[PDB]
Design an enzyme around this catalytic site. Structure first.
Site, PDB file in Angstrom:
ATOM      1  N   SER A  83      -6.529  -1.318  -5.171  1.00  0.00           N
ATOM      2  CA  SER A  83      -5.723  -1.125  -3.973  1.00  0.00           C
ATOM      3  C   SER A  83      -6.644  -0.907  -2.783  1.00  0.00           C
ATOM      4  O   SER A  83      -7.541  -0.060  -2.834  1.00  0.00           O
ATOM      5  CB  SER A  83      -4.769   0.065  -4.132  1.00  0.00           C
ATOM      6  N   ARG A  84      -6.419  -1.673  -1.714  1.00  0.00           N
ATOM      7  CA  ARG A  84      -7.243  -1.548  -0.516  1.00  0.00           C
ATOM      8  C   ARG A  84      -6.841  -0.326   0.304  1.00  0.00           C
ATOM      9  O   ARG A  84      -7.657   0.568   0.550  1.00  0.00           O
ATOM     10  CB  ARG A  84      -7.142  -2.822   0.327  1.00  0.00           C
ATOM     11  N   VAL A  85      -5.581  -0.275   0.735  1.00  0.00           N
ATOM     12  CA  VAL A  85      -5.082   0.844   1.527  1.00  0.00           C
ATOM     13  C   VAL A  85      -4.221   1.739   0.646  1.00  0.00           C
ATOM     14  O   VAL A  85      -3.114   2.132   1.033  1.00  0.00           O
ATOM     15  CB  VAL A  85      -4.292   0.351   2.753  1.00  0.00           C
ATOM     16  N   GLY A  86      -4.722   2.066  -0.542  1.00  0.00           N
ATOM     17  CA  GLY A  86      -3.991   2.911  -1.464  1.00  0.00           C
ATOM     18  C   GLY A  86      -4.599   4.289  -1.622  1.00  0.00           C
ATOM     19  O   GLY A  86      -3.967   5.197  -2.170  1.00  0.00           O
TER      20      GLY A  86
END
Ligand SMILES: Nc1ncnc2c1ncn2[C@@H]1O[C@H](COP(=O)(O)OP(=O)(O)O)[C@@H](O)[C@H]1O
Ligand SMILES: Nc1ncnc2c1ncn2[C@@H]1O[C@H](COP(=O)(O)OP(=O)(O)O)[C@@H](O)[C@H]1O
Ligand SMILES: [Mg+2]
Ligand SMILES: [Mg+2]
Lengths: 470, 498, 49, 163
Positions: free
Chosen positions: B368-371
């Site tokens: 997940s990048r923006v997790g």
């Protein structure tokens, strides 16, 4: 009055304009269309079908245009703002500002379509550019003022490689930058502008040194193909009229060839290989030749290529390898093992990897490290089937040294601190050559393979082995 | 109530009073899902049309003397010489807050039999995404209910999380559990914590769409969720336009001050429907028999699901696209195009799905990048280095008795079995933080492997009666300080010895 | 369910008998329908002029 | 001079190209009667239509040699140049499409159309179609109108679908 035309055909991005008068528009001419939103439209002429009719390509959405609309010609190409006024602002493909900070007060407006440099105005050099990575300062070294290619697939590490190099080379370069993103994401454009303002790259209330050009994949096919010509026009004026070492950062460079292939079928052109356009080598060579180093100034191009479904033999990846001095191929197989990043040493090559530019000490370390990785990769069929015990005495020592050398070149970047958890390591050029020569001679054979993974030079490898054994 | 049939007959008596002003003309030929209409000089590009039998049409290409209209229905409803009817507008669909609780189609018509939809407007399907000035970073947390999704690759409001995988592995099951787990926040009074679901079943069968809508209504989850029915038995234009029509209805809540969650199931079925209409119009086929605009159709629809700033309303739109892989081939033409435009993906391997690990979420492939910043502080503090320890334990177990390898194999087996939940069994943020803290601190190493399912149910019931103050503080505050971390360790150690 | 099925069957049977009576009345040479169809075309074209 | 009538673009450009040079010195009224004689002596005759579908000929009876097929018929001005362009470009098979497009140009700039219902309309030659349609609809509804429809069929189908 200007030259007015009538819309005769409209199929997607292609809009054929039929001029009533005999003075028809030329190729690559900016055409304006009146609408109803205080913005009008933009259309670039491609070819002429004859009978007082020329097929034009719109730079925006053609939804809402009827048969017979007024199309006025501007008389020239798509001009954009150049100079020092474009630094810190978010421009588009037509030169308009998209940062909601008023209009760009520029003195001159150069066109996006221009010729490249000739053979007498070229200037070649061999200056090495230190990036900070251990796999780039020893294998394929980049050249100052040349074209750098960051090839890779989806999810390998193409966007993270350009962000880490711009935060450690462009921040202390002296000249102006040019980050022109073509075919990027919607979230990538907003995150790059907020990070550069807090570090001192794009100052809204002060002095800036980085030109931003919008153009993601949410627009039509005409705006994505013309995004590369708008960003290259601002960087060419700072190196010719001013004489400054500009830095062109394209992300990604593969979106320029893919946008023109979707509109080539509606213009009358036949399809080429893998459903591409027939003028693949002519359209890519006209834009790559203008982003080179001339006698008035240099231009360090740091673009990134995208592999189509993890294939380097495509028509958009193999044609861009002959116009770059240094290449950085990112394989998808090394990214799943734990290499940060997946810098393939058997595929990355450059023109500065010689003994006359890097010295005799750096040339011997690069040839010895590449020879050990090639012997272990060719014998992978016997180690994965029979096992590691089927080797002899000489092959057993080479397999252990190849695994530790591959993990030592993968250093943690400063921009990837939230995904890895470790700090950013920036090894120098002299420290990376001394650490690789000592491990290949037998001075670090007693250490483990995990002590060199995600570290720096020779100082970080000795400190990680002592903490894991306590 | 007192002759209900007489009220509908009086209101539908006078309506047709002005519908004879030339407008569209007639057609010429029809076939292969297209209709060559001869005339309609005032028709704009990408405008809605109507045939004589009632079939809708979309004028794609408009040349001189003819106009290529793409029919959205069967080819038997259009013949040679039939009159057409111009609508005057583009390809729009109904949107608003009145569509919650009804199953709509591709054009916005109701197919559930509940009557008309009280729409508050009309948004076009081909809408442009927002720029870098009307966007913000993803900071809100999106609770999915799964213990292996909320701790590894978490999702947030405004991000695009893909769901790749093969058939019968956990692709459609991950999207159904996230929509049913939002009942704890949508039934209250907190409007910022609620998230309206948007299931867009494209390419599915007729029997699978009716069975999935009945299961959500029985658990109080179909009252605030939009269902876009798009079976494969219709035309090729209805299935391809299902992604653009579903995004316009969910964009009204993000532009006003609410959160939305779109689930495009599946992304592989939408690419096959768009290639059928392009191959019949004499186009150029590239890789895997696809046109040149194959990558632009999926990148434009996924770029609109972003998080707005405070000056635009403060809403966000989440996209959950499911990619159907053919034998785990993640390097395909349709697989690499969806992974390069989304901020993370959820790979569903078919090898671990047949052994009992449901859902089969690979720790070494899904990320997940923006997790990280869009997650809860209580679940991230208890799961220290959970993503790094799960990927290293799978590679060591496949090649294996030393002393160091025995400790990682025992701790890794208990964490994978406790995080695997059953179907339609979502957990909250307070219950998942207590189960993940015991497996990472060594409190579950003394238990057996077969007692992993019994230990999760016993620890959740004992922590909701004898220690209610520790479970309510982790859900309201969302974090754990020094006093909250010491109370959770003392309660887990006393319950494991009894 | 039985009350809703009886109400739906009665409404469907009553609508079928009314549709058959409207079709039989138009085939009996209705003089009022021919005069009303010609006057509606002249009033609709004058409103848009 | 190009009139706004469109009329396709490829097949309909045969009569539109010759109408520009024939609209000078009043030469448009004689072209209407001369075009009807060429199609009436090659269709309902079964004598001179032997080379209408065959691909032979090749300058044998189409062009050059004519005499009775041009001078004795009704061609002396610019009517002989219209048949010579169709013989060299192999366009003699579609003689009905070239003659039908010539009559539509005179009925658009000097007439009207827009058929309402039943039969044809009035096709006035005044100015605008606003005051011409209102004065012709009242005079045609009373005289004639047997009414042996479209509005009654659409209203009956909408009531049965909502049952
Ligand atoms: N140095 C690194 N260490 C760990 N992960 C990395 C590193 N560089 C890149 N990545 C991962 O690679 C992924 C690249 O994602 P994305 O940019 O969407 O695809 P692409 O790189 O193909 O454009 C990121 O999610 C990131 O987590
Ligand atoms: N947590 C779970 N426990 C048990 N079975 C599950 C779980 N999640 C999914 N499944 C099974 O996986 C199957 C998925 O079916 P389907 O949705 O048609 O395929 P896909 O998941 O590939 O879209 C379901 O039949 C369901 O029984
Ligand atoms: Mg990228
Ligand atoms: Mg499914």
């Amino acid at each position: 009055g200007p030259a007015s035309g009538k819309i005769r055909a409209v199929i997607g991005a292609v809009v054929d304009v039929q001029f009533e008068q005999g003075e028809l528009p030329a190729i690559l001419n900016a055409l304006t269309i009146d609408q109803g939103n205080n913005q009008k439209l933009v259309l670039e002429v491609a070819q002429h079908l004859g009978e007082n009719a020329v097929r034009a390509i719109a730079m925006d959405g053609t939804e809402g245009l009827v048969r017979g609309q007024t199309v006025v010609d501007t008389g020239a190409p798509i001009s954009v703002p150049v100079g020092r006024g474009t630094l810190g602002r978010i421009i588009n493909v037509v030169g308009e500002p998209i940062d909601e900070r008023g209009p760009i007060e520029c003195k001159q407006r150069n066109p996006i379509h221009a010729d490249p440099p000739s053979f007498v105005e070229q200037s070649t050099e061999a200056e090495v550019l230190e990036t900070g990575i251990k796999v780039v300062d020893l294998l394929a070294p980049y050249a100052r003022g040349g074209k750098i290619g960051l090839f890779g697939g989806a999810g390998v590490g193409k966007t993270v490689f350009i962000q880490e190099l711009i935060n450690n080379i462009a921040k202390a370069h002296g000249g102006f930058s040019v980050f022109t993103g073509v075919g990027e994401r919607t979230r990538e454009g907003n995150d790059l502008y907020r990070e550069m303002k807090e570090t001192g790259v794009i100052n809204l209330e002060g002095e800036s040194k980085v030109a931003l050009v919008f153009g993601q994949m949410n627009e039509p096919p005409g705006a994505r193909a013309r995004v590369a010509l708008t960003g290259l026009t601002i960087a060419e004026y700072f190196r010719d009229e001013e004489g400054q070492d500009v830095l062109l950062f394209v992300d990604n460079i593969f979106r320029f060839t893919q946008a023109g292939s979707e509109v080539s079928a509606l213009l009358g052109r036949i399809p080429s290989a893998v459903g591409y356009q027939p003028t693949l080598a002519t359209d890519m060579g006209l834009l790559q030749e203008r982003i080179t180093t001339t006698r008035k100034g240099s231009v360090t191009s740091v673009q990134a290529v995208y592999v189509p479904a993890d294939d380097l033999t495509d028509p958009a990846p193999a044609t861009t390898f002959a116009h770059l001095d240094a290449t950085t191929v990112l394989s998808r197989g090394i990214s799943e093992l734990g290499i940060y990043p997946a810098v393939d040493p058997l595929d990355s090559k450059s023109r500065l990897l010689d003994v006359s530019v890097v010295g005799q000490e750096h040339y011997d370390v690069a040839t010895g490290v590449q020879q050990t990785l090639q012997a272990y990769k060719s014998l992978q069929d016997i180690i994965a089937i029979l096992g590691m015990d089927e080797l002899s005495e000489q092959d057993k020592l080479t397999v252990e040294r190849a695994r530790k050398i591959q993990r030592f070149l993968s250093q943690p970047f400063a921009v990837a601190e939230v995904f890895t958890g470790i700090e950013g390591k920036l090894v120098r050029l002299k420290d990376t050559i001394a650490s690789f020569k000592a491990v290949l001679e037998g001075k670090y054979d007693h250490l483990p393979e995990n002590a060199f993974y995600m570290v720096g030079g020779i100082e970080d490898v000795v400190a990680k082995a002592e903490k894991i054994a306590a | 109530p007192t002759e209900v049939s007489s009220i509908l007959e009086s209101k539908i008596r006078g309506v047709s009073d002005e519908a004879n002003l030339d407008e569209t003309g007639r057609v010429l030929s029809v076939g292969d899902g297209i209709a060559r209409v001869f005339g309609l000089n005032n028709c704009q590009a990408e405008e809605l049309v109507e045939f004589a039998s009632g079939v809708k049409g979309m004028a794609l290409n408009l040349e001189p003397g003819q106009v290529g209209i793409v029919l959205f229905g069967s080819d038997r409803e259009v013949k040679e010489g039939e009159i057409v009817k111009r609508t005057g507008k583009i390809v729009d669909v109904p949107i608003g807050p009145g569509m919650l609780g009804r199953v709509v189609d591709a054009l916005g018509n109701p197919i559930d039999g509940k009557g008309p939809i009280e729409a508050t407007g009309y948004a076009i399907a081909q809408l442009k995404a927002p720029g870098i000035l009307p966007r913000r970073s993803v900071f809100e947390p999106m609770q999915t209910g799964l213990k292996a999704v909320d701790a590894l690759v978490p999702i947030g409001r405004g991000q695009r999380e893909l769901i790749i995988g093969d058939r019968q592995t956990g692709k459609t099951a991950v999207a159904l559990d996230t929509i049913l787990n939002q009942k704890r926040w949508n039934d209250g009074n907190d409007e910022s914590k609620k998230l309206y679901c948007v299931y867009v079943a494209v390419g599915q069968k007729r029997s699978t769409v009716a069975q999935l809508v009945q299961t959500l209504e029985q658990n109080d989850a179909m009252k605030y969720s939009i269902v876009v029915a798009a079976t494969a038995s219709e035309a090729a234009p209805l299935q391809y336009l299902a992604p653009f029509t579903a995004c316009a209805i969910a964009e009204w809540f993000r532009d006003n001050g609410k959160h939305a969650l779109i689930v495009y199931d599946d992304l592989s079925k939408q690419a096959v429907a768009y290639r059928q209409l392009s191959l019949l119009l004499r186009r150029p086929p590239g890789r895997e028999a696809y046109p040149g605009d194959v990558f632009y159709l999926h990148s434009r629809l996924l770029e609109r699901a972003a998080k707005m700033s405070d000056a635009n309303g403060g809403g966000s739109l989440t996209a959950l696209p499911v990619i159907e892989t053919q034998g785990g081939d993640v390097s395909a033409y349709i697989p690499t195009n969806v992974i390069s435009i989304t901020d993370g993906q959820i790979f569903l391997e078919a090898e671990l799905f047949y052994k009992g690990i449901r859902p089969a979420i690979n720790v070494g492939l899904s990320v997940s990048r923006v997790g990280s910043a869009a997650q809860v502080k209580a679940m991230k503090q208890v799961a220290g280095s959970l993503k790094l320890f799960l990927a290293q334990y799978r590679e060591v177990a496949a090649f294996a008795l030393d002393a160091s390898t025995k400790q990682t194999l025992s701790r890794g087996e208990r964490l994978t079995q406790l995080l695997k939940q059953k179907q339609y069994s979502p957990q909250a943020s307070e219950e998942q933080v207590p189960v993940i803290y015991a497996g990472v601190n060594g409190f579950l190493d003394n238990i057996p492997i077969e007692r992993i399912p019994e230990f999760e149910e016993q620890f959740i019931a004992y922590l909701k009666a004898n220690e209610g103050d520790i479970l309510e503080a982790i859900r309201t505050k969302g974090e754990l300080s020094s006093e909250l971390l010491d109370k959770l360790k003392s309660a887990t150690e006393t319950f494991v010895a009894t | 369910r039985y009350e809703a099925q009886v109400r739906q069957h009665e409404q469907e049977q009553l609508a079928s008998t009314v549709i058959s009576k409207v079709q039989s009345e138009l085939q009996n040479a209705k003089f009022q329908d021919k005069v009303l169809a010609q006057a509606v075309e002249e009033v609709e074209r004058l409103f848009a002029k | 001079i190009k009139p706004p009538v469109q009329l396709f673009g490829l097949d309909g450009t045969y009569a539109t190209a010759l109408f520009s040079a024939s609209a000078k010195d009043s030469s448009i009224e004689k072209t209407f009667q001369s075009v009807q004689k060429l199609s009436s002596t090659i269709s309902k005759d079964a004598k001179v239509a032997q080379v209408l579908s065959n691909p032979a000929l090749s300058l044998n009876s189409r062009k050059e040699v004519v005499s009775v097929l041009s001078k004795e018929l009704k061609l002396e001005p610019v009517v002989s140049n219209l048949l010579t362009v169709l013989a060299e470009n192999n366009r003699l098979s579609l003689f009905d499409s070239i003659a039908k497009q010539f009559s539509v140009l005179n009925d658009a700039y000097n007439g009207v159309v827009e058929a309402t219902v039943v039969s044809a309309k009035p096709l006035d030659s005044k100015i605008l179609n606003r005051l011409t349609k209102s004065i012709t609809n009242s005079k045609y509804v009373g005289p004639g109108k047997t009414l042996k429809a479209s509005k009654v069929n659409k209203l009956n189908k909408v009531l049965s679908e909502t049952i």
